[PDB]
Amino acid sequence: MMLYSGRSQDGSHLLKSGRYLQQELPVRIAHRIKGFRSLPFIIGCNPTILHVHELYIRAFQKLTDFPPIKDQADEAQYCQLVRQLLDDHKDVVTLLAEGLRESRKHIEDEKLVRYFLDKTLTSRLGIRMLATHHLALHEDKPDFVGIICTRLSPKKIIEKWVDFARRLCEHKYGNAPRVRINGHVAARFPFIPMPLDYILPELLKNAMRATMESHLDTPYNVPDVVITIANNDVDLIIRISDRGGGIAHKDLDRVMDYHFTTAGFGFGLPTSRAYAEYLGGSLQLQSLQGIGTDVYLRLRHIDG
Amino acid sequence: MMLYSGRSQDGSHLLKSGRYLQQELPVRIAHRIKGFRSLPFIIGCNPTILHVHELYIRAFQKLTDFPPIKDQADEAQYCQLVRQLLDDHKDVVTLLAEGLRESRKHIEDEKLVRYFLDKTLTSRLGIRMLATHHLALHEDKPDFVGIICTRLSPKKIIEKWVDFARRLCEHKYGNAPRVRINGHVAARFPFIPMPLDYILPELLKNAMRATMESHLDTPYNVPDVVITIANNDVDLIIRISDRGGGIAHKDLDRVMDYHFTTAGFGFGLPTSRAYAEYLGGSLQLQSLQGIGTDVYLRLRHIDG
Ligand SMILES: Nc1ncnc2c1ncn2[C@@H]1O[C@H](COP(=O)(O)OP(=O)(O)O)[C@@H](O)[C@H]1O
Ligand SMILES: Nc1ncnc2c1ncn2[C@@H]1O[C@H](COP(=O)(O)OP(=O)(O)O)[C@@H](O)[C@H]1O
Ligand SMILES: CC(C)C[C@@H](Cl)C(=O)O
Ligand SMILES: CC(C)C[C@@H](Cl)C(=O)O
Ligand SMILES: [K+]
Ligand SMILES: [K+]
Ligand SMILES: [Mg+2]
Ligand SMILES: [Mg+2]
């Protein structure tokens, strides 16, 4: 899938973008529907899975019922539909999580659900990126072409999610680790924030929770979480290192499983990894049992 | 292979150990000889490889020519032979490195040399551990049963090799990174130092070299190397983190190859990894291109 960076005054680029989207969305939704159709019967019969399956069918119906975009008037209305659908599907990850939680235990091939979720959630991420990019082309935000930031600062977006995770953590525990950021703190480059907006808060919540739950005697004095930024011509690496006691040997082969948690609902890690790999990067964990965990998020740079 | 921890005043345990060694060594040397016999012809014909092949045949001959140990007198003489052989074989890794350097380019299956070296060097490590353990049983060192230290301090043995690597580094560059050690600095537990004596200096030399070569403008002021110790009931983890600029993407899939170097002779990494895995652990690298590298040495704890 491609995110149009084209620009024009007659607004011709919006028409071209809209037409591309109109061509592309129905095909990709059709693929998601095929995924639901192939789910093991007993899982497909779960009422929450059925609800999500039906949402996708509705999306496909509405998208295919929309006439070919001929002019700006049409394109404007197509954007209304896209906005509606994005909103109607905003809770899909949570619905799948709930729908699958019990039902998946009823089949033996455990690879199956993992594959379905990886494929479904990453396709969905790409679909939402495409659609949101098109809508964003109508915005006049400085330093954005659609959802592409022309000068993203890793430090700034990390700090945004740090503040967010610290507030949640402070609410639950009365305090939160301080976060230090080092390495290429001054880096700025073209980049799409959206995947970071998903991934960063998941990894930060994990690191903070781990830190608090291993320092229950001294909640007022916990070890910092330390984030290192490395920017090179190939990828961006963000290392998130905590002293939260590590991931136990007995849990290590399970933490990347959808639904596994030692506590939200165990999607943070497998989802983040699937997203990173979908975009050409990776998510790798290094556990120092008894000390802490290093998490390495790598995302490939944009090809201008 | 098993390292006898048995003890006795009549010296009966030395006889039992000697007899075990006498049973075990010829079989293991025979396996190494079979490895040389199966090397690709053109490699096996290299005069340095032939020399090493012949050393192993000699070892096998001497070991099999030694009569069955009947008493302390015999056992004492068997130890002389073992000492001689250990000394005669002390440069084997270097000879294999040289012998293989050019010759390996003459075959296409590159997996072949890697497999031969992994198998040969790890078997050799185990053979030397067994033999050195037997000799050591005659020593009266406090806190040792043979080569097994009953209360090893990871911090102490790390500091030993830090001092060693810093001296080499200081000699070549006029300075050396300081090394900080954190985590479980007070840990003490039963452990066999020998593999650490190989591995630690290799990883420290790498980290220090990388650090100096990336700070050629400020040799008098370079970033510390930071070592973290994590001790748990399953394994010992030693993380060696540097700010030496990382391992480049173009080099990453090559650094674990025997002979690959960007400069000694490119054996440090593949050998250390083979040793760690041989003993039930691992050696893993995390490169932050543009910043530095984290190296994780994991070694499984001793089963008492
Ligand atoms: N930084 C960390 N330190 C220790 N444990 C962690 C860390 N990150 C993740 N984990 C473990 O992995 C499990 C799964 O994490 P995740 O998939 O994000 O789901 P959740 O946070 O909802 O449990 C967590 O329950 C926790 O046990
Ligand atoms: N900590 C490190 N930082 C940067 N590069 C490294 C590091 N460790 C190893 N390397 C790279 O890996 C290569 C192979 O290392 P090694 O197998 O120990 O052989 P050698 O040190 O003899 O080159 C080195 O030449 C170097 O390019
Ligand atoms: C555009 C829209 C159908 C989005 C879907 Cl892919 C979803 O978010 O689940
Ligand atoms: C005991 C002796 C033959 C050692 C050999 Cl395995 C070697 O160091 O190469
Ligand atoms: K999980
Ligand atoms: K190498
Ligand atoms: Mg989580
Ligand atoms: Mg080396």
Tokens of A103: 């039902």
A24 has a chain B CB within 8 A of its CB: no
Strands B179-183 and B225-231: parallel
Which residues is B286 bridged to in the sheet?
Answer: B294
Give the tokens for residue B230.
């994590």
Q: Are B269 and B202 in contact (CB under 8 A)?
A: yes
Q: How far is CA B103 from the centre of its chain?
A: 24
Reading the block at residue A49, the tokens are 């899975």
Instruction: Out of A237, A249, A288, name the one closest to residue B288 (CB).
Output: A237
A116, A61, A119: which is closest to A88 by C-alpha?
A61
The number of angstroms, rounded, from the C-alpha of B255 to the middle of its chain's C-alpha atoms is 17
Q: Assign A222 to helix, strand or coil.
A: coil
Asked if B291 lies within 8 A of A230 by C-beta distance, the reply is yes
CATH superfamily of A151-304: Histidine kinase-like ATPase, C-terminal domain (3.30.565.10)
CA distances from B58 to A183, B65, B89 (A): 55, 10, 11
CB-CB neighbors (< 8 A) of B154 in chain A: none
Token pair listed for A20: 């591309």
Distance CA A155, CA A47 (A): 43
Q: Is A292 in the pocket of ligand 1 (CB under 6 A)?
A: no
Strand order of the β-sheet with A179-183 is: A179-183, A225-231, A235-242, A292-300, A282-288
A62, A52 contact by CB (below 8 A): no
Bridge partners of residue A228, in order along the sequence: A182, A239
Q: How far apart are CA A110 and CA A107, in angstroms?
A: 7
B290 min Cα distance to partner chain A (Å)? 6
| Inter-chain CB proximity B291 and A234 less than 8 Å | no
Residue nearest to atom 7 of ligand 3 (CA): A89
User: Is the Cβ of A289 closer than 8 Å to some Cβ of chain B?
Assistant: yes
Q: Confirm or reject contact between A251 and chain B (CB < 8 A).
A: no
* Count of CB atoms situated within 10 Å of the CB of A277: 14
Tell me if B10 sits within 8 A of B105, measured CB to CB.
Answer: no
| A239/A292 Cα distance (integer angstroms) | 13
Write down how long chain A is: 304
Query: Could you tell me the distance, in angstroms and rounded to a whole number, from the CA of residue A199 to the centre of ligand 5?
Result: 13
Among candidates A179, A195, A182, which has minimal Cα distance to A238?
A: A182
Contact A77, A239 (CB under 8 A): no
Contacts of A288 in chain B (CB under 8 A): 183, 228, 230, 237, 239
In this structure, chain B runs to a length of 304
CA B18 to chain CA mean position, Å: 24
Half-sphere exposure of A42 (CA within 13 A, CB side): 10
Name the method of structure determination: X-ray
Residue environment code for B230-262, b if the CB has 16+ CB neighbours within 10 A, otherwise e: bbbeebbbbbbbbbbbbbeeeeeeebeebbeee
Report CA(B125)–ligand 6 centroid distance (Å).
Answer: 19
Of A228, A229, A288, the CB nearest to B230: A288
Helix A47-65 / helix A92-103 crossing angle, nearest 10 deg:
140
Alpha-carbon distance of B17 to B136, in angstroms, equals 11
Tokens at residue B35, please?
Answer: 């490895």
Other Cβ atoms closer than 10 A to A59: 24
Domain residue extents for chain B: 1-150, 151-304
Rg (chain A; Cα; Å): 21
Which one of A289, A293, A295, A297 makes the best mutation probe of the B interface by having the most chain B beta carbons within 10 Å? Answer: A289
Report d(CA B294, CA B241) in Å as an integer.
Answer: 4
Spatial separation of the C-alpha atoms in residues A165 and A167, rounded to whole Å:
5
Strands B235-242, B292-300: pairing kind: antiparallel
What resolution in Å is listed for this PDB structure? 2.1
Name A98's Cβ contacts closer than 8 Å, sequence gap at least 6: A48, A265
Q: Which ligand is nearest to the CA of A114?
A: 5
B232 close contact with A: CB closer than 8 A: yes
Place of tokens 């000492």: B83
CATH assignment of B1-150?
A: 1.20.140.20
Selection from A29, A211, A277, A42 nearest residue A131 by Cα: A29
Q: At what angle do helices A194-213 and A268-278 cross, to 10 degrees?
A: 150
Q: What is residue B238's three-state secondary structure?
A: strand
Show the ligand 2 pocket: residues with CB < 6 angstroms: B 202, 206-207, 210, 242, 244, 247, 251, 255, 260-269, 293
Cβ atoms of B176 and B218 within 8 Å: the answer is no
- B267 and B196 in contact (C-beta within 8 Å)? no
- Residues of chain B with Cβ-Cβ distance to A181 below 8 Å are none
